[model samples]
Structure formats: C-alpha cells, structure tokens
Target chain A: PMILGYWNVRGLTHPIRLLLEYTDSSYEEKRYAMGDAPDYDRSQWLNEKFKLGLDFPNLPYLIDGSRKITQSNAIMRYLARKHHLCGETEEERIRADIVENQVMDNRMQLIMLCYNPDFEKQKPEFLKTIPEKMKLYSEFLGKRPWFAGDKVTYVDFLAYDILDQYHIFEPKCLDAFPNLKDFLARFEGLKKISAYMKSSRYLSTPIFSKLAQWSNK
Target chain B: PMILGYWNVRGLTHPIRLLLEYTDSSYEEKRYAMGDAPDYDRSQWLNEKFKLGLDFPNLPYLIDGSRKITQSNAIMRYLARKHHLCGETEEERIRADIVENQVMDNRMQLIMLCYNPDFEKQKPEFLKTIPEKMKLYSEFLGKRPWFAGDKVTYVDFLAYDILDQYHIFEPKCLDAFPNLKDFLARFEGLKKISAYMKSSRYLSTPIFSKLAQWSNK
Candidate 1:
C-alpha cells in the first residue's frame, strides 16, 4: 500500500486524496494536526522529516512502496501515470497537462486569497476577476465531457478540487459557468469519489486556519 | 517544427529555450517585445492571446505543429517526452520530476526577488535562506553527475537555468554547493547548449521589467 504523509489540513493533499479514492487505491495517510500535541515545529513528523532520510523532505510527500516522491503535483502525476490516468496518447497527455496547469494557476490565486494578510482588501479584488477566471475554464470545457477529452483524467480531479474550494470559499462561484458546474456534478457523482465524499474517510478539516479563512475575513 | 511564443524577456522561456537547444530541435520563437508600448495589457501579444483561438492562450505557449501547449513546465514536459529527455524508466521520471519541482520552487523565489518592490529589503532576507536552499540541492546532487541519476534528464536543464539565473543575479551563488556548481559547468559544456549560450540568438533581455529591476531599487 502507498503511504501519503501530510498535514491534517486539506491544504495540498485534498486532490491527491481524491485521486486515490477515484483510482480505488489502497493507501494510508499520516496526517499531522495542529494542537494534537504541542507546537507544530516541535511535532514528531516535522522534526523527523529531514532525519527520515528522504532525499528531499517536504509535506504532502508520498511513499509509494519503495520509492518516495515529494511535491504535490509530481506526486499527482506519478500516481496518475501509475493508474493509467495520464491519457492514452501523446496529444491526450498534452491536453491533460494544459488543464492541469490551468487549474494549478487557479488554485494558486485562491491560496493567495486565503493566506494574504490583507484578506479584506484582496478578497474584493479577487472577486472582481472571478467572472473572467470562470470564463476561461468555461470556454475550455465548452463541449468536451472532460478537460482532456471524453475520458476522465487526473486533470479533472485537480480542477474539481479547486472548484470545490471555490464553492466553499464563495457560494455559487460556478453559477455563471454552467459547464464547470456540470463538470463538478459529474465528478462528484463518480461511484468511488461519491462514496469517499460521503464516508468518514473524507476530511472535514477547515480549508484554511482561523486567520486565513474567508469566512473569518 | 515547433513554434514557441513568449515575451522577448527570458523570464519564463529561458529554460524552454535551453531544453530546445540541448535537444537540437528546429523550432522558431515568436518574441514580443514592449517596444515603448504604453501598457502591457494593451500590447499586441497580450491582447491577441485570447483572439489567437488557442484552446487556452498564455505567454510561453508552444505549438508543436498542430498541437499547442501552455504552461512553462507543461511545455517542457511535452518537449521532453517528444525528444525522449524525460527519463529512461518510470522511476527515473519520478526522480526527474522531484528535481524539477525543487528547482522550479527555487526559481520562483529568485524571480520574486527580482520583481519585488522592496528588493533592497527582501534581497537580504532571501540571502539568509540561500544556504538552507542550496544545502537541499547540494544534498540531492550529492555525487551524481546530474540531478537525476546516470543520464541527464530535462530536469537538469530546468535546474541549470535557475542556477544560471542565480549566478547572474548574485555572483557565485553556487559557491557553497560545489556539486551544483560542477553540474552547471557540466551542463554548459554540452556542445549544443554551449553553442546556444555563446550564440547571438541567446536572449540579452533583463529578467525583469525596468520598474521591477533590482538596479532601479
């Protein structure tokens, strides 16, 4: 079984967790939660990460049997390839990659909004660009059933996760984009993903800490 | 033949350019310069990006015949896969990807320094973390001739370009990481890459805009 280690928060590991569920992979997650013990810096996992002999130690690191991989996107790509979800042909892979990049760029913007010290100021600016941002994805997903094509790829999960966050952070964020709205519904309706979402296995942790939460702002 | 399009600045296209050079690929670059343009948003390429009818339009977009790809890393991966520079095995690809993420993260940090409004204040803070950042890469490079084992994968080019930027931004930035220093030299010694570096075709544009340049600070 693969072993994925990350903080308890759904910061970077949510999409990976979703991918594992959709692929029906058996794996264990080591979640480090704040206040479960003492200070986070002095926590067992954080302290031992470097000493664990990892070539490069970072959170959201995945240990797939013998080999360990760091970087969230790298881990996702690795798992996608292992599960044959990258795509069948070279062109498909390119298509998957473009969507992956698009969603990642979108994810980063939301993350900045969540973490920016001037949340009150940044939130208004971000909301102003929401239509333009949504339009880009909406256009990309115009007629295709999936971002890469007819088949579901890991790019879908990546995009789905970001849109999921937007839904939480801003209610009805996708109302204008009917296609993206349908895309989310279709992804959420996947058998394994739907089961996991309803199960206790899925995380209920806050997307951001107290200060970073949009609701808090 | 492939067509790579980006601003005349080497900001996002440098590594892609280096990859094309090392692979000895016959590709044309479409460089859009500011040319005393009033506003970047009003600039030709930026304004024309969406109108270009690309599935998704962005700077540093690549057109490999009929297939167009965006995202700098995605483009690199596409090209690497096309030219067989990704890796020999699945495991090697994972290794290459880890290093790619590491260097990309490193590259972003330096790029932020180049463009930050408070460059004088931030540069000092960034320098303090240089040793820690350099140490991680130094440990990874260890005794390997390249970031990945045995063969030099495209990750090497990505890492080398960032290190090259560091070398330019801060002289002898790699002094402490002898392994990385040697890796840079070894990469520069490659015939095709060396020729490109020495050629007049190599980009001479500053890494950042005039307003964001550190010298302006």
Candidate 2:
C-alpha cells in the first residue's frame, strides 16, 4: 500500500490522488498543515519525517511498502505503470509521460502567474502565452480520444487535473483555451473522477492567494 | 534530419547531446546564448527558429523530421526509445523510464543549486540534504555498470551527464561518492564522449564549486 503525504489544498498531489481513485488503488492520503499556516512546507516536514526513515526530498512523495519514491511525477508514473494508468503500449507510455510532463509545466507556470502576484508584470505575457499554448494543445488533441492512445488514460486525467487547477486559479485562462476546457470537462465526466469530485474526499476550501506572497515570485 | 535549437549552455541540451553521441545519431547542434545578461530576450536568430513550428511551448527544443519537440527531458526519453536506450524487456523499459526520471529530478535539484548564486540561503536544506542523496544514488548504482540493466542505457547517460555537469560545479562532490565517481569516469572514458569533450564542441569553463558563490561565504 502506498501512502500519499500531501497538503489539504490541491497542489502536486491532486492528479496523483485522482489517478488512484480512477484506478481504484488502495492507498492512504495524509494531508498536512503548517501549524497555524495553511501553506505546507515540504522541506520542513522532510527534515522531521526523514528521522523515521521517511526521507522524502519533497512533497507529494509516495512510500510504497519499503521503497520510498520522491518526485510527484515520478511517483505518478510508477503507480500508473503498476495500475495500467499508463497507456497500452510502449510508445503510448512515452507519449503519456511527455504530455503529462508538458501539462504539468504549464500548470506550474499558470499558478505562479495567478497565485504569485509579484510576477504581475509578466501577466500580459502569460495571458497571451497561455491561450496560444492551449490552442496548440487543442490542435494536438484534435479528434484523438486521448493524448497518447485511443483510450482514456492517466494523460487525460493528469492534463484535466492541471487545467482544472488552473481554472481554480483563474477561470478565464482556461476559457480562452477552449479545447483544453473541453478536455478538462471530458475527464471530469469520468465516472471514477466524477464520483470522487462529488465525494467529501475532495477539498473545496478557498485558496489563500496571499500566502504565496511570502515567497519569491 | 534532426537539428537541436538550444542555447550553448550545458544545462538542458547536455543530456540531449550526450545521448545523441552515445547512440551514434547525427544532429546539428545550433548554439545560442540562452543564458546571457538579457537571458529572457531571445536573439533574432532564436526568434526565427521557433517560428518554424514548435508543437506546444518553449525552448531547448528539437526538430525531428516533421515534428518539433519541446522540453529537453521529453526529447531525451523519446530519443532514447528511438535510439534503443531502453531496457531489454517491456518491464525493463518501464523501469528504465522510472530510474531515468528519478535521477533526472535528483540531478536537476543539484544543478539548480549550482546555478543560483542565492540558492544556498534560498534553500539551505539541500546542502546537507544532497550529500545524503548522493549516498543514496551511489547505493542505487551499488556498483551497477549503468543505470539500466547491466548495459549502458539512457538512465546511465543521464546519470553520467548529471555528474559530469556536477563535477563542473563541484569536482569533489562526486569523489566522496566513489561508485558515482567511477561510474562517471567510465562514461568519460567512452570514445565518443572523450573525443567530443576534447574537441571545441564541448565547453571549457571553470566552475567546480559546491556552493553557488564561494567568495560570498
């Protein structure tokens, strides 16, 4: 059994949690807090936790039995491979990794722009850049059922999770990228994910955008 | 025909170029000053290159036949498969991806620390933390001839390139971890790498520091 140690707010762990639900895997999600602060410090927890042999270099890490896995994307890919969240073939698997990593980068950039207001000067560039990029993503999706293969897989779930997170940050950003919006909705409609979304397992608390200000832009 | 359109820096394109040489593939390495004073501002030469058609997003991109690939790690993995840098079997292939991505992330944190003049104060945890990590990596290598299977694969190339870059940042960092040091030296001894490194194609810079700004201390 894998234990997912994460923050209550959706950051890196959401997509991985979504994948677990989608795959119906047995794992524990341990959401953390910052004493009085809502923001989770990955390094602080890592120092405290590593003494117990839980040496996670960063957050959204997975502990599967005896093997420790760091790097959220790496953990997700590992679980996906074990649970068939990876596409059917070798080539499809590579595509899944590529598309997921690409979307992950986009999500990070979008959040940094929306959440970290200090980068406010870069806002215009982000606004134009995001929409342009999403259009390109949409064009890539075209009529294909999924980014990697003919079936719904982790790529769809992961990409949708990132877009939906971005929507939480700024809905208009996703709106301008229609195909990605459609893709976002497409995955949300997934039975496993839809059910999870409806369940209390999903956190609906409002994000304190101001907290991001304490850190650098 | 494939052409790599990236800056001359050893950051992103090193992995791509190293893997290209390891697999004996021919591609033109077009260099640009990707990290100059005005690093964000693309030169006129770079501006014209992206216009040719990047599928989705930014630089350290590869133009492969009709397809233009962005994201260096993605390019490495894709090229690894195309050049047969994977493991012997399907499971082995997946494992190769796993270890490669993990090492990539680990090496990335190290590289980032080396690049940022303010990184130590920015994240002091990694200083003590990374040495422990280097030990873990050495144990993982455990004297394995390479990062994948018994043979040299993409992960091996990734690990080697990371250390090679690390040595440039901190020479003695690898020395403390003998397995990794010997492992990197093995790759340096490879005829292709040796030849390429001696040639003017590789960089000649003085940067073997454990910290970003040693004098600042």
Candidate 3:
C-alpha cells in the first residue's frame, strides 16, 4: 500500500483515489492545509520534487514504498492497467484511452468555465452555451454501456469521478443529458465501490469542502 | 499525404510534425487563422469517426488518410508507439512516458506565464518564481543523456523541441541555465533531427508572432 500525499485532496488527485478504491487497492492518505504547518516542509514539497527525479510540481502523487509516481492521469492509467481495469482488446484499450481523455478534457473546460474566478463571473453567459459541448460525449456514451463496449474500464471510473464529482459542485452541468445522469447509476451499483462510497475516507468529501470555499452566493 | 489543419506550429501540434518527420512520415500542412473557418470538416470527420464509433475534438489532431485522431499528447504518444519511438524495457517505456509528460508540464507552465493574459500581467511574479521550476528540469536532464537513458526516445526529441522552441520565442529564457543549453545541443545532434532542422518549411519561423501582438514591448 502506498501513501498518497497532497495539500488538499482536490483537483488532480481526486480521480486517483477513486481508481485506487474501485480497484480494491489500499493507500495511506495524508492531507495538508495551507499555512497550517511549518514552511520548511512546504518549501520541501515545492523544491524536493527533483530529489526523486520528478519533473513536475503539484500533488496527488503516489508513493509506492520507495517508488513514487507523479502525474495524475499517468498514475490512474497505470493503476487501471495493473488492476485489470483496462479494455480487453487492443481496440478497446485505445478507445478507452480516447474516451477517458475526452472526459478529462470535458472536465477541464467546464472547470475553466465555472470554477475559474475571473471566468465564474461570466458563468451565466458561458453556462448557456456550455451544455452543448456534452452533446458529443453524451452521444458517444449513449451508444455504449461503458467507455469500453460492454464492460467497465478505468475510463468509466475516472470519468464517473471527474464528471459526477463536478456535478456536486455544479449540479446543472450534466443535468441536460439523460444518458450521463443514468450512467452514474452504474457506479453506485458496483459492490466495492458502493461500500467505499459509504466509507469515511473517499477523497471526494474533502474536495467538496474546498469547492465550498470557492463558491459564491 | 493527409492534410494537417494547424496554426502556430509552436503549440501542441509542433511535435506531431516533428515526430512525423523524425519517423520519415509525410503529410500536407495547411494553415488558417483562428475562427476563420470551421477549421475541420466536422461532419466528414465525425462520420468516419462514428462509423468507427470514436468521438473527439480540437487540434493538434492527426488525420490518417481519412481517419482522424485528436488531442496533441495522445497523438504524439500514438506516433511514438507507431514509429518505435518508445524505449526498450518496461521501465524505460514508463520512464519515457514519465519524462515526456514532465517536459510537457514544464513547457505548459512556461507557456502559461507567456500566454495566459492575466498571468502575463503577473510576469514579474512568475518570472521571479520560474527559475526554481526550470532548475528542477535541468537537474533531471543533467542525469540522463536521453530522457530514457542511452538511446534516443521521443521524450528527448520533445524535451529538446519544447525547451529550445521557448528560447526561440524568448532567448532570455535560457540565460540562467548553461547545462540546459548544452543538453539542447546534444538532443539536436540526432542525425534525422539535424537534417529535419535544415528544411525551410520545417523550420520554426514566426515564433514571435503571438508575443509581438500580445506584449507591450
């Protein structure tokens, strides 16, 4: 079991935790709050990234005992492959990659529209036009039960966490599409996922706390 | 030759053409100003994609004869795999993926400092902070000749393109790091890459166009 460390379990790391839990993997989770700890550790987190040959800065990285993995999407993809969460065939694997990334891009664009502080002020205008973007994915998902045909893959889990988690922050986002809404039910039906959903440590709970800090009346 | 729809070759698609050339792959290049046209034949592209049951959006995409693939990083990864640009061992392969993404992340941060309008106004703050960022990458590259040890991997080619292309736009960007400057030269010395550099069509010109329009200077 690895320990996942982050300042807050928000943004990039949330999807990683869901993948871990859904795949029956175990991890020790640590969280830090800004300005709460000694600044030395803070500086180390920012600067010590190079010590392990990690190239990027940021959180939600997996420390597998001595092996550390960074990059949110990469970690999720690795876990999916390791846990039999990948598509069964080569084409299925490639399509799952396409669909998973499409979900990530959709989430990125929507977050830019709704959560970006400067962009948030224009949300009313942007939100009107934003739903149309999902017409593409909704149609794709409507055609298949999961991102990989007939079976659930890591793409399904990651997409569920990113899109459905965003839905809690901005409910109207996926509301227009019946398929996406119904698609969420599939997650709740997974036995281990259902238990984890009820558990105390699912990462989504803390992310909602941060989202509340950013939300305005 | 398939038609490539791109503008501002420095952005995400730069590597697509770079890797294609490195692999001796050929395609027709076309350019159009942003928002001037549909940019792609969406119906035609989607019809073929849907017939294959695929869905995607935006540039830096690849159209294989009539088949289309979108997302710049995914396109590069596919090309690298298709053309044997990946490394030899499993560890090498994962390291290549890690390093390529790390460079992409570093390049994204730098580009954000340059292109993000709000972040641009905050350049004094960003500039002061970015050296620490670049040093992490420099030290990482200092440890390996190619991004994935002995041989050339797509990561090295991309690491060179991203770092050097930045210098082409802003030469002062390289002033702080002598090691990176040397590393840049080593990567460029690849025979295929060196030859590709000689082509007028392949050479990156107009690297300053966006900065010229955007900067007050």
Candidate 4:
C-alpha cells in the first residue's frame, strides 16, 4: 500500500491524486492540516516532516513500501513510469519533458500571485498575463490529442492541473484557446478520471493552504 | 549540429554547456548580449526569440535539427536521454528525478535572492539557509558515488552546478559536508569536464543577466 502525504488541500497533490485514481492504485492519504489564521501554524506537518525517513522531506510525498519519494513531479513521474504513462517514443518523451517544466513555470507564477500580500492589487496584472501564457500552451499543444502527442503522459496530468487552476482563477482565461478547453474536457471525460471526480476522493476547494491570501486564489 | 541560444552569460547555460562538451556533441552558440543598464534592453534576443520556432520560446534553448526545446531541465534530459546518462536503473531514476527538482528549487532560491532589489539585505538570511539545505543533499547523496548511485547521471551535473554556485557565494559553505565537497571535485575531475573548463568555451563570469544586482550573487 502507498501512503501519500500532504496538507488537506488539493495544492500540488491534485495531479498526483488524479493519476493515482486514474490508474486505480491502492493508496491511502495522510492529510496534514495547517492551523487557523493569525499564526497559520504548520506544526502539523513540521512535527512529522523530518521523522518520515524522507531523503528530501516535503509535502505531497509518496511512501511506497521501502521507497519514499518527495517532490510532486518525482512522485507523478514515478507512478507514470510504472504504468508506462511517461511516454513511448523519443518525440513523445521530448514533448513530455518540455511541458512538465513549462507547466511548473506557469504554475509557480499563479502560486506567487495567490500567496502574495497584495493579491487584491496584483490580481489584475496577474490576469493580464494569462492570455499570452495560454497562447503558448495552446500553440504547444496544437492539434495533438495530448501535450506529449497522442499518448497521455504524466505531463498531461500536470497540464490538466495548471490549466484547471487558471480556469478556476478566471473562468474565461481559456476561452481564447478552444484547444485547451477541449483538452480539459477530454481529460475529465476519461473513464477512470470521470469516475474519480464523482467519488468523495475528489477535492474541489481550498486548492492552496490556509496561509494563502485566498484558499483557491 | 545543435544550435544553443542564451544570453552571453553563464546563468542557466552552464550545465547545458558542460553536458554538450562532456558528450562531445557538435553544437554552436548564439549568445545574446543585453544592452547596458538604464533599460537593460533585451532587443538582441527579443528580435529572434519567437522566430526560433521553439514551442515555448525562452533562452538557454537547444535547437537540434528540426526540433527545438526550451526549459533547461528538458534540454538536459533530451541530451541525457540520447547519451544514456539519465539513469540505468529504477533506483537511479528515482534519485535522478528527486535531485533534478531539488537542485532547481535550491537554484531558484539563490536566483531569487540575486535578482531581488534587496539582495544585500537578503544575502545573509539566504546564506543562513545554506548549511541546512546542504545537509539534506549530503544525506540524500550519502555514500553513493553520484547522486544517482554508482554512475553519473544528468542530475550530477545539476548538483555540481548548484553546489558550486553556493560554494562560490560562500566558499566554505560545503565544508560541513565533506562528501558534497568531494562530489564537486569528482565532477570536475572528469577528463571531459576538466578539458572543457580549460577551453575558451568555458564562461566563468556574469553568471546572471544584467538586471541582477550582482553577476552571480
């Protein structure tokens, strides 16, 4: 059995959770909770972060028997490798790697805005850059059924998560990129993914920790 | 021949340069120089950034034949995969994936400090976090000859670059981790790497773009 650990929020764990469910992997979760506002204490995770025997202990870690992995990308790749969902061809792998990091760059930008003290003021400028960013992804994705070409690689999960975040942040952010919108709908339409979304395991809100300016901002 | 493009600075290109040299790959550079400050103009690159046909146009890009890739890690993996240097075993891959990202996280922290207007004030606190971070890497590396154990992988190059950055910032920072110090030496000790360092191709200064407070802060 695998034990995935992270704060109760969806945060980075969203992609991992989606991949796990899509693959029907048997895993449990240990949801850490950040304390209420004012202090916004992280003692819940801090207390066990070091004791878990993780090489580089951080949130959204996966503990599979003797193998304990940290870093959400690593965890996603680990599972993807097992399922042959990473990529099958050189072109596919190349596309996979590019989108993986590209997704993170875009993801971090949104995270920064959400966590900023002046999020209210920064929101507009942050939203201002969305169309340009979406344009890049739309072009990169092009007519391919998946970011890594025809096959659904781990990066697809990454793309789905980040695109979903932006879509939530500004529902019309992806309207200009009809291809991206189709990609999102296509991902949710997957048999296992669709099933999981309907299950209680699906986490829809508090996309970030309580420390952020807004839960799902 | 591959066409590598980036600003005329070491910045994020160091590892890509090292990997190319180590592999004895046929490649040439198109170094873009940012105009002197006041504006810190980037017209040198802006003029051709989108013309390169890169999906996600960014610097430190590698254009091989008809394929163009951005995002340093993706480029590294593309080259590493070709050379069979990504990893040879499951354990090696897991370690490689972890360090690949861990290195980036640490590298970004330093980049953040360097690029910040308050670099002078943030420098000490940033330095203060080094030992703890280094300790994690040291333990992760343990007795393994490389970060991925036994054989050198692309992440070893990554580890070398980030560790060296910290070492340059505070020469004695890696002193507490003897193994990490040795890793640095071992990486440089490679005949290809040693030879590359001695060549005119090696770039040692202006590690950051013109906008950065210090070249390599």
Candidate 5:
C-alpha cells in the first residue's frame, strides 16, 4: 500500500485519487484538517510537512515505499508510468503533456480566485471567461475519446478534474461544449471511478481549505 | 524551421530558448511587443493569436509544421523527446517531472508578484520565503550535477532559468547555496549556451513586460 497526504478536502487529491482507483493501486490517505478561520491554524499539516522526507514538502504528496513524490502533476506521472498510462507514442505523449500543464493553469486560476479576498468582486470576470477557456479545452479534446487521443491517459484525469470543477462552479458551464460534457460523463462512468464514487472512501465536501472565500461542499 | 512566439522580454522563453540551442534546433522567433502602459495595448499579440493554428493560443508557443504546441513545458517535452533529454530511468524521470512542475510553481509566484498591483507591499513576504524555497531546491539537487541527476534534462534548463532570475532579483540568493552557484556556472559554461549568449539572438533587457511593477533590464 502507498500513503497519500493532503488537506481533508476535494482539492488536488481528487485527480490523483481518481488515477489511483482507476489503476487499482492500494493506497491510504492522511487527510489533514485545517482549523476554522481567524488563524486557519495549519498545524495539522505543517507539523508533519517537514518530517515527510519530501524534498519539496507540499500537500497532495504520494509515498510508495522508498519513493516519496510531491507536486500533484509529478505524482500523477509516477503512477501513470507504473501503469503504462502516460501514452504509447510521441504524439499522444505531447497531447497528454500539454493538457496536464494546461489543466493546472486553469486549476490555479480558479484556486487563486477562491482563495482571494476579492472573490465577490472577481466572480463576474472569472465567470465571463469560462466559455472561452472551456472552448479551448473542447477544441483540444476534439472528437477524441479522451484528451490524449483514444487513450485514457493521466491527463484525462487532470482534464476531467478541472473541467468538472468549472462545471460545478457554474452548472451551465459546459452547455457550449457537448464534447467536454461527454468527457465528464465518460470519466465518471469508468468502472473503478464509479465504484469509488459509490464507496465510503469518496470525499464530497469542501473542495478547498478553510481559508478559501469559496469552498464547494 | 520551427516557429517560437513570445514577448521580447526574458519571461518564460529563456528555458525554451536554452533548450532549443542545446538541442541545436533550427528555429525563428516572433517577438511580440506590448505597448506602453495606461492601456498597455496587447493588440500586437491578440491580433494573430487566434490565427495561429494553436489549440490553446498562448505566448511562448512552438510551432513545427502540423504540431502547434502551446504552453512552454509541453514544447520542452516535445523537443527533449526528440533528443532523448527526458532521462533514461524512472527514478530520474520522477526527479525530472517533480522539478519540472516545482520550477513552474516558483515561477508563477514570482510572476504573480511582478504583475501584482501591490508589488512593494507584497514583496517583503515573498522575499522572506526565498530561503526556505531555495533550501528545498538545494536539498532536492543535493550532489546531483543537474536538477534531475547527472544528465541535464529539460528541467535543468527550467531550474537554471528560475534560479538565474531569482539570483538577478536578489544578487545574494545563490551565495547561500554554493552548489547552486556552481550549477549556474556549469549551465552557462555549456558551449552552445555560451555561444547563444554571445550571439545576436539574445535579448537582455526587460525580463518582464511593461505592465509588470518590476522588470529587470
């Protein structure tokens, strides 16, 4: 079994967890809880952050025996590589790589907004850009069964998470892109993923920490 | 010849450019210039962004025939894969992947600050965390000649550019990490890089755009 650590929220771990379940990998979770605001005491995670044997200590880390990995994207790659999910060819690999980082760009933009004090003032602008942003993701995905061609690469998990987050943030977000909506459905319909969603291990609240101005519960 | 597009500033193109030179790729640049502030008219870039075949039109894109790659990291991977610069083993690959995204995290932090309205107010807090951040990088590098181990992967180029940028931002930054200083020296000592620096292709001024509160020139 492997160890995964992150705040007890749906945040970045969702994609990693999705990949783990789909890959049928045995893993455990160390869900750290942040105390309610004011100080938003981070002691739960901070106390163990330095002791995790991580070179770059961060939340959403994965530890598999001698291998200690941080950075959600890197963690995805490690597991994907082990399961032959990175992609089989140079072209698919590029699409996968592009979407992996591309997904993060959107993720950070949303995360930044959620954690900012200007959330109320900034919401309109963020919502306005949704169509344009999701359009590109739609175009990138195109008619392919997944983000990286016909394969369900790790990037599919990433693309799914970001697209899902946006879709949840604004329910009508994907009405413009049927392909992306289908991507969501396809991602959710996977046997392992569907099973995981039904299982007790699923986390369904507080997509962000207590510090965020907006937390999807 | 391949086409690489970005602003005239150093920004994200440094790593991509260094990789291009190291790989000995034939490429041309389309340096877009942002107008002076007040409007900071982005017309120069916005004009042709959609016309480009890029699925996700962005600065610092690399176009090679049918492949219209956006996002600098994907562009690096495309070139590195062509030259076997991604590393040979899973361990090294994991190291490479971790540093790849880790570099970007620090990059966005710096970039966010540069473009933030409260640069002066926010800088001290950003500065205070440099030691902790740099120490993590140093610990991660350890005795390894490059970021991902003995061989210089694309991330070495990425790490070098970020470290160099921070060093320029604060001259005494690398003084605390002797090995990091040596790493910078080693990177600059490369024949191709040295030649590129001496060549007419290098643009030294305005590390950031006109809109940024701080631009190292």
Candidate 6:
C-alpha cells in the first residue's frame, strides 16, 4: 500500500488527493498536524525525513512500496505515469506538462500571498493579477473540453484544484471565464471525483484554518 | 528540428543546453538579446511567444514539429524521456525527480536574492543559510556517484548549472562541500559537457546582467 505523508492541512497535497481519488487508487495518508507555536511539530517530519531510508525525504513525500518520491509535481507525475493519465501521445504529454506547470505557477503565487506577514496588505495588489492569469487559462481552454484538449489528463486535475482554490479566495473568481467554470463542472461530475467531493472526507475549506477563518469572516 | 527559445542570457536554459550537448541532440536556439536600455527589449519574446501558435507560450519554451512545451522542468523532463536520461526504472525516476526539485529550489532562492531591490542589505541573511542548503546536496552526493545514484540523470545537469551559477555569487561556495566539489569535477569532465564548457557559447557570467552587475561587485 502506498503511504503519502504531509501536513494535515491540504496545501500542496490537495491536487494529489484529487488525482488519487479520480484514479480510484487506495492510498493511506499520514498527516502531521500543525501546532500553535512556530516550528512546533515541524521536526516530526524533519527529524525523520532523511532517516526514513529514502534518498531524499520531504513533506508531501510518497512511499510506494520500496519507491520514495518527493516534490509535489514529481509525485503527481509519478502517479499520472502509473495510472496512464500523463497523456496518450508525446504531443498530449507536452500539452499536459505545459498546463501542469501553469497550475503550479498559480499555486506558488497563492502560497507567496498566504505566507506573507502582511497578507492583507499585499493581497489587493496580488488579486489585481488574477484576471490576467485567469485569461491565460481561459485562452488555453478556448474551445477545448480539457486543458490538454479532448481526453482528460493529470493536468486537468491540477487545473481543477487550482481553479477551485481560486474560487475560495475570490467567490466570483470564475465569473469571467465561462470555459473554466464549465471545465470545473465537468471535472466535478466525474464518477469517482463526484463521490469524493460530496463525501465527508473531502476538505472543502482552505488548508490554513486561521487564514480562512479570519479572512472569510 | 526542435526549436528552443529564450533570452541570450543562460538563466533557465543552461541545464537544457547541457542536456542537449550530453545527448548530442541537434537543435536550434532562438536567443533574444537584452537591449542596452533598462527593460528595453522585454517584449522581444512577449510579443512573439504566443504568436508562434503555441497553446501556452512562455520563455524557455520548446517546439518540436507540432508539439509545444513550456516550463523549464517540463521541457527538461521531455528531453530526458526522449534521450532515456529520465531514469532506468520507476524507482530511479523518483530519485531523479526529488534531486531535480531540490536543485530548482536552490536556483529560485538565488533568483529571489538577485532581484531584491535591497539585495546588498539582505545578502548576509541569505548567505547564512548557504551552509545548511549546501549540506543537503553534499550529504546526498556523499552516498552516490550522481544526484540520482550511480547513474547520471537529468538532475545532474540541473545540479551542475545551479552549482556553476552559485560560483558567480560566492566564488568559494563549494569548498565546504567536498562531495559536491567532486560531483562538479565529475560532471565537468564529461566529453560533450566539457567541450561545451570550453566553447565561447558558454555564458560563464550570471544571466541576469543587471542584478549581478550591481550586487556582486
């Protein structure tokens, strides 16, 4: 059985979780909870990461039998390859890769904002760029059913997660992108995914409890 | 023929270039030169990137026939898969991916430093973390001949480029990490890479001309 470990918070691992569900893969998650104090429980993973008998150990690390993989993007790609969701042809793979990277870039930007001490102050300026960023994705999804064209690939899951997270940040975020809205709806309608979405197991709220609680109120 | 496009500076394209040389893959590069004025020719790429008919266009993007790929890591992986440098097995690929992400993290840190308006003021604080960061690579290399173990993979090219670039910021950066030093020597000794290193095409200096010019001196 594959055991994926990360913080209980669904930061980088949300998309990975969605991918696993969509593929109907049974994998256990070992989630570490964050304490009130800084660096409170970081060592739970940090102290044992290198000692885990893996070449490199980092949070959101995956332990699949004897194989250990780190890096969120790498882990997702590894699963994609295993499940045959990477893409059908070399061309599809390229398209999938481009879309995946775009999603990652968007995630990184949100992380930068979330971690900023003056998040509230910096957020407005950051929010201004959202429309421009969304346009790129909208344009990519111009007339296609998925980010990588017809068949859904791993990039579609990534795009869905990122777009979902965007909606959390700004409620009417996808108002401007009809294609993207339809894209999200199409993904949520997937058999396994829809089941997971409605289940109590789904983490509908933001990963950072304090941030969402404070900001949303 | 595959066409790779990026600025004349060897910032993100260096690893891809090394991979191309190591594999002896014939390709063309469309390097847009940085003009004399401040931000003078930024549009050189911005203007034509999407115009090239790529679904999602970005710098360091690669085009092979009908296939268009963006994102540095994705492009590198694409090339790696084609050249059989991704890894020999699934396990090796995971190991390679982890190392590759580590190298990218280090590169991103340096970039953050280079672009900071008050880089000189922040340099010391950043430099303090160098040992901790280098130690990770040093320890990883201590147990293996390459970043991904006995076999040299695409991560080695990434590690080489990052470590090579680090030399510009801190000349004696690798002195504390003997294993990394040996790793550098081992990679630099490869026939194709060595030839490329000696050629005039090699951009020995830092890629972001303005930042390095002001901060390093």
Judging by DockQ against the true structure, name the best candidate: 4
What TM-score does chain A of model 4 get? 0.97
Which run of 10 residues does model 3 chain A get worst, by summed lDDT? A208-217
The sequence of per-residue lDDT tens digits that candidate 2 reaches over residues B1-217 is 6888765456567667878876778788766553334244456455675476765646677777776677777787778778777688644554465566666666657655656677667556555565666776676667677766577777777777666655555556676887887787788888888887787777633222223343211
Per-residue C-alpha lDDT of model 5 across residues B104-192, encoded as one tens digit per residue: 99998898999889999999888988988889888899889988888888989999899998887878877889889899999898898
Off by over 4 Å in 3: A36-57, A87-90, A113-115, A206-213, B35-54, B118-120, B169-179, B206-217
lDDT score, residue A154, model 2?
A: 71
- For model 4, what is the alpha-carbon lDDT of residue A175? 83
Q: How far is A76's C-alpha from truth in model 4 (Å)? A: 0.7
Q: Write the per-residue lDDT of candidate 6 for residues B54-146, one digit (tens) a residue.
A: 666778888887777788988998998798886787767776767777877788888888888787898889888787777777777776888
Residue A115 in candidate 1, Cα distance off native in Å: 1.3
Cα RMSD to native, each candidate? 2.6, 4.6, 4.5, 1.4, 1.3, 2.8
Residues B1-217 of candidate 4: C-alpha lDDT, one tens digit per residue: 9999998788789889999999999998898877876676889699888897888999889989977989999999999998989888899999999999999999899888888999999998888888899999999999889999998889989999988988888888988999998999999999998999988868866568677866732
* TM-score for each model: 0.93, 0.81, 0.83, 0.97, 0.97, 0.89
| Residues B1-217, model 3: lDDT tens digits | 7556555445666667778888888878655343212242344444344454335656556666545566666666666767777787856766675666576666666665666657657667766755675675676666677767777777776777677766655577777877788778876776777788877767554332344323312
What lDDT score goes with residue B69 in model 4? 88
> What is candidate 1's CA lDDT for residue A176?
86
lDDT (10s digit) by residue, model 1, range B169-212: 76766787788888988998988987888889896345565445
Worst 10 residues of 6 chain B by lDDT: B208-217
Q: Can you give the DockQ of every candidate in the order shown?
A: 0.69, 0.36, 0.41, 0.93, 0.88, 0.59
* Chain A only, candidate 1, TM-score: 0.91
Clashing pairs in 1: none
Cα lDDT of model 2 by residue, A78-190, tens digit: 77767776777766765675687688667657655656546667776666675666676777677676777688877776777666655654567766556666677777788
True contacts kept of each: 0.69, 0.29, 0.31, 0.93, 0.90, 0.62
Better of 2 and 3 by TM-score: 3
How does each model score on lDDT? 0.79, 0.66, 0.65, 0.89, 0.87, 0.79
Total clashing pairs for each candidate: 0, 1, 0, 0, 0, 0
What fraction of the native interface does candidate 1 get right in terms of contacts?
0.69
TM of chain B vs. native, candidate 2: 0.81
Give the residue spans of candidate 2 off by over 4 A.
A37-44, A51-57, A65-67, A88-94, A111-128, A204-211, A214-217, B33-41, B88-99, B102-130, B204-217
- Stretches off by above 4 angstroms in model 6 are A37-43, A209-217, B35-41, B212-217
